[PDB]
C-alpha cells in the first residue's frame, strides 16, 4: 500500500501529472473532497458557508503540526510581530502580548500556558509542504492564495468574533475547537470589502453554523459571514486557514477602468469635451435638492447616458492584463515536480515548451512589451519587487504562441520569428530564466 | 465722453437683480444679434464676427493711455503682469528683460515691433473689471481677460488654438484676424492649447477679416486664429476669455470614482468577486481570443458601468464646482443703491422689521461638507485671480432653512422676522452677520 495521509498521496500524485493547470484543479478537489468542485464554486463560493466531516483524523498529515512549530520558533528568526502575534479573549476583550523582537520556544510556550493563542503568519515561508499547498492552489485561484497557522490552548478563545474581507478554508489539523459561523448581518455586510470591528456577543444572533471540527475536516466561509472559534474540553487545537480573493471584485476592477475610460471618452469623442450648461449651478447642488426645474433632471440623465456610453471607452482587456501583473508579483514560486526541475536550467540546445502554465504573463507598457514572471519570488509577500524582461516585437509572436500553447512542445525552428537568430535567442533568454523546460536534458 | 459703453453702464447700474444686469450687458456684447441664438446655434461651433460700424461702441473700457498710466503708476513687472511678443520670418522670440517694467523700457520694445500684453488689467482697471464681473455671472465659469498691444507692420504671436472661448473685443487701430476651422475631429473642441504652428500646416482661413474700433471677433476652443497689423495703423485689442476646463468629461471625471465607490458600498453585485479564471480569456496578449464567456465578461462591464450612473452624486460635485467657481470669481461691483443699501455706508442696529434680501444673486453658494454648512463667498476675493485663499462662514443648522430661502428668494425683500428660524436670537443674528460681512442689504438706509 504506497501511502499513509492521503495528503502525501495526493501529493506524490501531483508530481506525477504533468500539467501544472491540471494539478491545480486536481489538490481543490481534493481539498474538498468528497464534494464537487463545480457544484462548489456555482452554489456554495461566496454564496454560503460549507462544512466537510472528512472522518478522517489522518487526512492532512504532513501539512503542518505542532512541531513542525516547535522547530521554526528554535531554528528560524520568528519576530513577535512579524511572523508571529500572541492573542486572548477573555473578559469580553481581546488582548495583544507581543514582548518586542524574538520570538524563542520558551517565551512563545509560556505565553500559551497561560492561555494565549499562538498565530503565525507565513509559514509558507518556512514550512516547504505549506508553500507547495498554497502555490498549487492559488494557481486555480486567479488570486493570491495565503495562509497562517493558528494555535490555541485548552479551555480558551484566541480571538473575538469578526468578519474578514476574504474567502477563508480552515483546515482543522490536530485538536478539536468549536466553531459559530454566521451569516451576513445586513445586506451591506453581504460580501463585505473591510475586516469588521471586534464584536461582542450581544452585537449578534444565532448562527447558521455551530460545529465542533476534529482534524481532516474542512470549514469554508465567504467574507462578510462572521465567525468566533474556541478550544473547550482539554484539548489543544491546531488549524492552518487558507485564504485569497482579497480585492478581487468587478467594483475593484471598475476603479481601474472608469478613469482611463473618461480620458479615452474625452479624446476621441466631442460630446465629452463639449461645454456645461452655463447657467447648471441655478438647479444643481444639495442647495436644491428638492428643485422642480425639468432641467434638473434632463442634465441628470445626461449625466447617466454618457456614463453608460463609457462601457464603449474602456480598456477592458489593458486592466485584466494589469491585474495579471499584479497576480504576478504577488504569486509564490513555482513547486517544480521532479519530471520538470531534471529537464529545466534548475537540473546547451538548437532549432530542434513553458516550464508551468501560472508563471508568466505578456504585458504592453508605453508601445512596449514585458514578459512578466513568478519563478524569481520570495515566499515572503512582496519581499520581490516584480520582475520581468523586454520582449522585441520580433519574438512577440513566438512568446505569445509558446503562453496559448502549453503543454504541447515546440521545436525552437518552429517558433514564428523572422530569423534563425531570434528563436534562438527567445528559447535561450526563457530557457535560463527558468521560464522553459526541454523534453531531453540539454 | 458719452458712448454706448458709458451708456450701458450707467443702464446696468440701474437695473436692481444682478443677474438681469449679466444678461443685459452680453446682449450688448454681441448686438445686433440676439444672445438666445448665439448660444443656441454658434456657441462652440461657429467663428462669429460682428461688423458693428461705430468706432465709439466700447469708448470707456480700456485705451492706450489707461495703459501708460498703469506702467508708470503700477508696479507692473515683466512676467508677471506683462509679456512682450515678436512673430518674425516663422519663430516667435519671446523677450522679458527681466525687472520693472516702466514705460522707457515698455515703448523700446514696442519700437523694435515688440507686441504688448497685458495679463492681468481688471485689476488696475476699474472698468474692465465690471465689465468681467457682470459678464461671468452668465457664463457661470470665469471670465479673464489680457489687453493686447501691437505696432504697425508687426505679428505678436505664432498661429494656435487656445484650450478656451474667446471674444475679441477691437478697441483702437486695425487688424488682420484669419479664422481656421479645427484641422481634425481631436482638434475640435480642444481640451489643451496647440503647439506653435506654422503658417505651413495650416488650410484655409474659413474666415477673414480687418477688424476696425468697436467689432467684435468670437470663435471657440480648437479654432485656429493670427493676426498681424499691416498698414501704418497698430490695434488694440482686449480678450474677454473664459470656459476653461468646462466640460462634460470634466464634470464625469468627478462624479466617477465617488459613484464606484458609493456603488460598492450600497450594492452586492460590484462587492461580488471577479471570476477565478478571467485572465484566460481577457488580456492584451489574449487581444484576438476567441472565448465565448469573453463577450459575457465584456458585457458585464458594459452593464455595470451603466448601472453607475444610476448611483453618481451629481449634487454634490455641481456643488464642489460651485465652490471652485466662488474661488475663481471676482468680487463683485455694486451698483449704487446696493452701496446704499448694504454694509458699505451704515451698520448693523436693524430689527424683525427691516426688510432684506442678498446682496447680488452671484457672490455666495451654501454647500454641505463634513456633516457641515458652509456659507462660500466672493465680496472678499481679490481682483486678482486666487490670490485669496477660499473664504467663508458656518451656518449652524437652526439657520439653513432661513439661508437657503435667502439665496432662493433674489431679490424678493423679506423681513426679518419672517425667516424661517426657531427663535428671534437666532433670526436676528444670520441677519446680522450675513450684513457686517457684506452679503446682504436692506430695503431702506439702515440710518
Ligand atoms: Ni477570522
Ligand atoms: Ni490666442
Given at each position: 500500500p504506497a501511502?499513509?495521509?492521503?495528503?502525501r498521496?495526493?501529493?506524490a500524485?501531483?508530481?506525477?501529472?504533468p500539467?501544472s493547470?491540471?494539478?491545480?484543479?486536481?489538490?481543490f478537489?481534493?481539498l474538498?473532497?468528497?464534494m464537487?468542485?463545480?457544484?462548489?464554486?456555482?452554489?456554495?463560493?461566496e454564496?454560503?458557508?460549507?462544512?466537510?466531516?472528512?472522518?478522517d483524523?489522518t487526512?492532512?498529515?504532513?501539512?503542518?503540526?505542532?512541531?513542525?512549530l516547535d522547530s521554526?520558533?528554535?531554528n528560524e528568526?520568528?519576530?513577535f510581530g512579524?511572523?508571529?502575534?500572541?492573542?486572548?479573549?477573555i473578559?469580553?476583550?481581546?488582548?495583544?502580548?507581543?514582548?518586542?523582537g524574538?520570538?524563542?520556544?520558551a517565551?512563545?510556550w509560556?505565553?500559551?500556558?497561560?492561555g494565549?493563542?499562538?498565530?503565525?503568519?507565513?509559514?509558507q515561508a518556512?514550512?516547504?509542504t505549506?508553500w507547495?499547498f498554497?502555490?498549487?492552489?492559488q494557481?486555480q485561484?486567479?488570486?493570491?492564495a495565503?495562509?497562517?497557522?493558528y494555535?490555541?490552548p485548552?479551555?480558551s478563545?484566541?480571538?473575538?468574533?469578526h468578519?474578514?474581507?476574504?474567502e477563508?478554508?480552515?483546515?482543522?489539523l490536530?485538536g478539536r475547537?468549536?466553531?459559530?459561523?454566521?451569516?451576513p448581518?445586513?445586506p451591506?455586510?453581504?460580501?463585505a470589502?473591510?475586516?469588521?470591528?471586534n464584536?461582542?456577543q450581544?452585537?449578534?444572533?444565532?448562527p447558521?453554523?455551530?460545529?465542533?471540527?476534529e482534524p481532516?475536516?474542512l470549514?469554508?466561509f465567504?467574507?462578510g459571514?462572521?465567525h468566533?472559534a474556541?478550544?473547550?474540553?482539554?484539548?489543544?487545537?491546531?488549524?492552518?486557514?487558507?485564504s485569497?480573493?482579497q480585492?478581487?471584485?468587478?467594483?475593484?476592477?471598475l476603479?481601474?477602468?472608469?478613469?482611463?475610460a473618461v480620458?479615452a471618452?474625452?479624446?476621441?469623442?466631442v460630446?465629452?469635451?463639449?461645454?456645461?450648461p452655463?447657467?447648471?449651478?441655478?438647479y444643481?447642488?444639495?442647495?436644491?435638492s428638492?428643485?422642480?426645474?425639468?432641467?434638473?433632471t434632463?442634465?441628470?440623465?445626461k449625466?447617466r447616458?454618457?456614463?453608460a456610453?463609457?462601457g464603449?471607452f474602456?480598456?477592458?482587456?489593458?486592466?485584466?492584463?494589469?491585474?495579471?501583473?499584479?497576480?504576478?508579483?504577488?504569486?509564490?514560486?513555482?513547486?517544480?515536480?521532479?519530471?520538470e526541475?531534471?529537464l529545466?536550467?534548475?537540473g546547451?540546445?538548437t532549432?530542434?515548451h513553458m516550464?508551468?502554465?501560472?508563471?508568466?504573463?505578456?504585458?504592453?507598457?508605453?508601445?512596449?512589451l514585458?514578459?512578466y514572471?513568478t519563478?524569481?519570488?520570495?515566499?515572503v509577500?512582496?519581499?520581490?519587487?516584480?520582475?520581468?524582461?523586454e520582449?522585441?516585437?520580433?519574438?512577440?509572436d513566438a512568446?505569445?504562441?509558446?503562453?496559448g500553447?502549453?503543454?504541447?512542445?515546440?521545436?525552437?525552428?518552429?517558433?514564428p520569428?523572422?530569423?534563425?537568430?531570434?528563436?534562438?535567442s527567445?528559447?535561450?533568454?526563457?530557457?535560463?530564466?527558468?521560464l522553459?523546460?526541454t523534453?531531453?536534458?540539454?
Amino acid at each position: 500500500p504506497a501511502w499513509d495521509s492521503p495528503l502525501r498521496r495526493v501529493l506524490a500524485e501531483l508530481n506525477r501529472i504533468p500539467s501544472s493547470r491540471r494539478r491545480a484543479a486536481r489538490l481543490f478537489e481534493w481539498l474538498i473532497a468528497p464534494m464537487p468542485p463545480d457544484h462548489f464554486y456555482r452554489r456554495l463560493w461566496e454564496r454560503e458557508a460549507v462544512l466537510v466531516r472528512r472522518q478522517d483524523h489522518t487526512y492532512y498529515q504532513g501539512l503542518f503540526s505542532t512541531a513542525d512549530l516547535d522547530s521554526m520558533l528554535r531554528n528560524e528568526e520568528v519576530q513577535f510581530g512579524q511572523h508571529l502575534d500572541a492573542a486572548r479573549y477573555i473578559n469580553g476583550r481581546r488582548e495583544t502580548l507581543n514582548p518586542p523582537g524574538r520570538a524563542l520556544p520558551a517565551a512563545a510556550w509560556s505565553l500559551y500556558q497561560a492561555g494565549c493563542s499562538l498565530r503565525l503568519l507565513c509559514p509558507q515561508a518556512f514550512s516547504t509542504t505549506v508553500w507547495q499547498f498554497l502555490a498549487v492552489l492559488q494557481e486555480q485561484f486567479g488570486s493570491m492564495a495565503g495562509s497562517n497557522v493558528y494555535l490555541t490552548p485548552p479551555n480558551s478563545q484566541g480571538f473575538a468574533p469578526h468578519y474578514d474581507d476574504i474567502e477563508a478554508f480552515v483546515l482543522q489539523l490536530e485538536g478539536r475547537k468549536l466553531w459559530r459561523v454566521y451569516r451576513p448581518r445586513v445586506p451591506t455586510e453581504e460580501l463585505a470589502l473591510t475586516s469588521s470591528p471586534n464584536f461582542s456577543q450581544d452585537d449578534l444572533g444565532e448562527p447558521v453554523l455551530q460545529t465542533v471540527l476534529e482534524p481532516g475536516d474542512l470549514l469554508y466561509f465567504p467574507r462578510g459571514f462572521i465567525h468566533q472559534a474556541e478550544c473547550q474540553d482539554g484539548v489543544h487545537s491546531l488549524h492552518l486557514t487558507l485564504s485569497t480573493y482579497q480585492r478581487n471584485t468587478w467594483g475593484d476592477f471598475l476603479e481601474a477602468i472608469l478613469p482611463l475610460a473618461v480620458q479615452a471618452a474625452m479624446e476621441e469623442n466631442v460630446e465629452f469635451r463639449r461645454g456645461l450648461p452655463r447657467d447648471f449651478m441655478d438647479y444643481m447642488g444639495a442647495q436644491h435638492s428638492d428643485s422642480k426645474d425639468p432641467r434638473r433632471t434632463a442634465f441628470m440623465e445626461k449625466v447617466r447616458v454618457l456614463v453608460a456610453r463609457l462601457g464603449h471607452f474602456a480598456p477592458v482587456d489593458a486592466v485584466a492584463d494589469q491585474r495579471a501583473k499584479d497576480f504576478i508579483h504577488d504569486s509564490l514560486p513555482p513547486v517544480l515536480t521532479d519530471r520538470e526541475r531534471a529537464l529545466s536550467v534548475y537540473g546547451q540546445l538548437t532549432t530542434e515548451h513553458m516550464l508551468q502554465d501560472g508563471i508568466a504573463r505578456l504585458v504592453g507598457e508605453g508601445g512596449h512589451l514585458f514578459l512578466y514572471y513568478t519563478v524569481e519570488n520570495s515566499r515572503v509577500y512582496h519581499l520581490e519587487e516584480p520582475k520581468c524582461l523586454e520582449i522585441y516585437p520580433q519574438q512577440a509572436d513566438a512568446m505569445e504562441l509558446l503562453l496559448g500553447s502549453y503543454p504541447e512542445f515546440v521545436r525552437v525552428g518552429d517558433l514564428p520569428c523572422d530569423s534563425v537568430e531570434d528563436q534562438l535567442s527567445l528559447a535561450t533568454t526563457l530557457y535560463d530564466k527558468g521560464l522553459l523546460l526541454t523534453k531531453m536534458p540539454l
